Design an enzyme around this catalytic site. Structure first.
Site, mmCIF file in Angstrom:
data_model
loop_
_atom_site.group_PDB
_atom_site.id
_atom_site.type_symbol
_atom_site.label_atom_id
_atom_site.label_comp_id
_atom_site.label_asym_id
_atom_site.label_seq_id
_atom_site.Cartn_x
_atom_site.Cartn_y
_atom_site.Cartn_z
ATOM 1 N N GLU A 35 2.441 -6.460 -2.860
ATOM 2 C CA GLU A 35 2.164 -7.565 -3.775
ATOM 3 C C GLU A 35 2.876 -7.304 -5.082
ATOM 4 O O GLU A 35 2.971 -6.163 -5.506
ATOM 5 C CB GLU A 35 0.658 -7.723 -4.014
ATOM 6 C CG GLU A 35 -0.221 -7.884 -2.766
ATOM 7 C CD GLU A 35 -1.682 -8.146 -3.128
ATOM 8 O OE1 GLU A 35 -2.179 -7.541 -4.102
ATOM 9 O OE2 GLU A 35 -2.353 -8.970 -2.460
ATOM 10 N N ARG A 53 -2.500 -3.309 5.857
ATOM 11 C CA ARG A 53 -3.230 -4.120 6.841
ATOM 12 C C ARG A 53 -2.677 -5.557 6.939
ATOM 13 O O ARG A 53 -1.866 -5.973 6.104
ATOM 14 C CB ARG A 53 -4.715 -4.203 6.445
ATOM 15 C CG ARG A 53 -4.932 -4.728 5.023
ATOM 16 C CD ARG A 53 -6.415 -4.967 4.802
ATOM 17 N NE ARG A 53 -6.781 -5.531 3.490
ATOM 18 C CZ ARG A 53 -6.667 -6.814 3.130
ATOM 19 N NH1 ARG A 53 -6.118 -7.719 3.939
ATOM 20 N NH2 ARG A 53 -7.066 -7.181 1.926
HETATM 21 MG MG LIG Z 1 -4.487 -7.351 -5.432
#
Ligand SMILES: [Mg+2]
Ligand SMILES: CC(C)(COP(=O)(O)OP(=O)(O)OC[C@H]1O[C@@H](n2cnc3c(N)ncnc32)[C@H](O)[C@@H]1OP(=O)(O)O)[C@@H](O)C(=O)NCCC(=O)NCCS
Ligand SMILES: Nc1ncnc2c1ncn2[C@@H]1O[C@H](COP(=O)(O)OP(=O)(O)O)[C@@H](O)[C@H]1O
Ligand SMILES: [Mg+2]
Lengths: 259, 255
Positions: A35, A53
């Protein structure tokens, strides 16, 4: 959404290269997400965190790339190699974007009561399919009882189309086609997000929901059928005050026929 | 032009697309059938509802059979025109999906196999036809564009063919000038909404422009494989008689 439709091909390649280097430098096995934050002012991307995951949102990447991510997970842990027809996955070069998708998660979180999840018996359940619509559900169905103990989730809706605008209206059509009764949902709130101008023209930040409202929030519902049934039951049981003590028409006489 | 099957077949003969040997319309069938040769398939011109057909193996059968075939075509379709077509004994059913606009552009969306049939009615359909070569697939695509160009085809329609398993020849059999039940498999492997195309088209749009919903022929690309099944109330444990009444619980499967 997938892809992120505001990015330049330079920014996508730039983003994707950072990701193969966070991954390779840990010899990551299986599926994982990297991210980043993107400062909307500079268009500069910042590493933030790794989830090791499959995520709730994997379905959009599935429909837009046509690669089964769960099946890849298993194949990969069977020992298969990325590239092999018998892995889940083609070689990078053969990994390609195809149109656009977005996912909405339908829940019992009540907009009309601060988003506390509703609970109880689902008396009606119909969901919507057709071209370009993927559903990931199985938990809800008429009769089902939503308990207070877990996730409020009812179903995940994924909508695909060749361009992002058409995807939005595919989602909009399927959402509005849903009939859920017995419990509250977040459908109206989902519909407001995706019908928003800032959403349509991709200009929202992360602060959009906490900021836009523009309460949105509200408008009620007519519920006319229930009202009519109430009337019919009332007059059927109690009679009409203008008629109840007065002469009565000759029994089952003909309905009038319009010539 | 496409409603009547003889007229349609004659259309295809006229633009160089292959057909099976077929008679003219039909009280002396063979002579006529005898010119075609046995065995033959009797087919209602016009009305083609996945069947009012009949395989006739010999001349002794002809009299009863054509008559019967006629009482039925009148029954089911209401026009009564029959013709004899030479029977393809071992056959695969393949079909081209075409889109034509009000400006003369026509595109194919590749083919479907619909050989999974119960007495000539389609049961399972697949896109693309799995057992085709890249060249056979281009061969079909080109016929259907000659068929569509010829009739200035406006909208979605389907061109259907019999592949002769013994030779790998194609023989145009019919057009369906309409969307089909099996369109869906073509949609998921090409990414092209056929119904939205229908509407953009009669709105006057040009195929190949964003507002048509349809790519130029060169950007129409096959992606994977797909098949379609129809779930019915026809009960396998009761002669496939359709069940009916209330569905009290119903859970379909997604993903
Ligand atoms: Mg986060
Ligand atoms: C949204 O509906 P609303 O603003 O609550 O109330 P309405 O006045 O439309 O009442 C409609 C009710 O009539 C019935 N109804 C709604 N649309 C209908 C249609 N096209 N045809 C027949 N019956 C219909 C349904 O019971 C409906 O409830 P719904 O909201 O589940 O569709
Ligand atoms: N000449 C033929 N020889 C062998 N089989 C045929 C022939 N014509 C039709 N059939 C079978 O009947 C099916 C329906 O034929 P078609 O012309 O499309 O009729 P319909 O109008 O009922 O669709 C075909 O798929 C094929 O399986
Ligand atoms: Mg047919």
């Amino acid at each position: 959404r997938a892809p992120a439709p505001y990015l330049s091909e330079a920014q996508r390649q730039e983003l994707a290269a950072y990701s193969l280097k966070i991954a390779g430098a840990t010899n990551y096995i299986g599926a994982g997400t990297v991210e980043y934050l993107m400062d909307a002012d500079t268009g500069k991307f910042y590493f933030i965190e790794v989830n090791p995951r499959i995520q709730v949102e994997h379905t959009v990447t599935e429909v837009v790339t046509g690669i089964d991510i769960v099946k890849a997970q298993i194949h990969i842990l069977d020992g298969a190699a990325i590239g092999t027809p018998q892995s889940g996955v083609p070689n990078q070069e053969d990994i390609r974007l195809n149109g656009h998708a977005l996912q909405c998660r339908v829940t019992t979180e009540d907009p009309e009561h601060n988003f506390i999840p509703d609970y109880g018996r689902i008396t009606a359940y119909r969901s919507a399919s057709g071209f370009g619509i993927r559903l990931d559900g199985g938990t809800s169905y008429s009769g089902a009882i939503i308990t207070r103990y877990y996730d409020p989730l009812l179903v995940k809706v994924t909508a695909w189309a060749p361009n992002p605008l058409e995807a939005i209206s595919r989602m909009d059509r399927a959402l509005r086609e849903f009939r859920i009764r017995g419990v509250a949902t977040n459908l109206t709130f989902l519909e407001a997000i995706i019908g928003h101008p800032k959403f349509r023209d991709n200009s929202y930040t992360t602060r959009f929901i906490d900021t836009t409202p523009e309460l949105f929030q509200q408008v009620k519902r007519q519920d006319r059928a229930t009202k009519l049934l109430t009337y019919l039951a009332d007059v059927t049981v109690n009679g009409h005050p203008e008629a109840k003590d007065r002469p009565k028409p000759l029994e089952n006489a003909a309905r009038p026929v319009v010539p | 032009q496409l409603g009547n099957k003889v007229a349609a077949r004659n259309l295809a003969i006229s633009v160089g697309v292959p057909v099976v040997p077929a008679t003219e319309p039909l009280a002396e069938v063979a002579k006529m059938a005898a010119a075609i040769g046995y065995p033959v398939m009797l087919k209602a011109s016009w009305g083609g509802g996945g069947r009012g057909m009949r395989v006739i193996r010999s001349e002794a059968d002809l009299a009863k059979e054509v008559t019967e075939a006629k009482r039925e075509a009148m029954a089911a379709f209401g026009k009564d025109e029959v013709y004899l077509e030479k029977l393809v004994e071992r056959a695969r059913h393949v079909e081209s999906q075409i889109l034509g606009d009000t400006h003369g552009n026509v595109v194919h969306l590749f083919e479907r196999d619909c050989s999974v049939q119960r007495r000539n009615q389609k049961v399972v359909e697949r896109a693309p036809a799995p057992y085709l070569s890249e060249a056979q697939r281009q061969e079909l695509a080109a016929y259907s564009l000659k068929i569509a160009g010829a009739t200035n085809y406006i909208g979605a329609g389907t061109v259907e063919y019999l592949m002769d398993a013994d030779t790998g020849k194609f023989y145009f059999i019919e057009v369906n000038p309409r969307i089909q039940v099996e369109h869906t498999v073509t949609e998921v492997v090409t990414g092209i909404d056929i119904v939205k195309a229908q509407i953009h088209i009669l709105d006057g749009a040009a195929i190949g422009t964003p507002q048509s919903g349809v790519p130029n022929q060169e950007d129409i690309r096959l992606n994977g494989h797909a098949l379609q099944c129809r779930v019915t109330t026809e009960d396998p444990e009761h002669n496939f008689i359709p069940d009916y009444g209330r569905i009290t619980a119903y859970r379909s499967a997604s993903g």
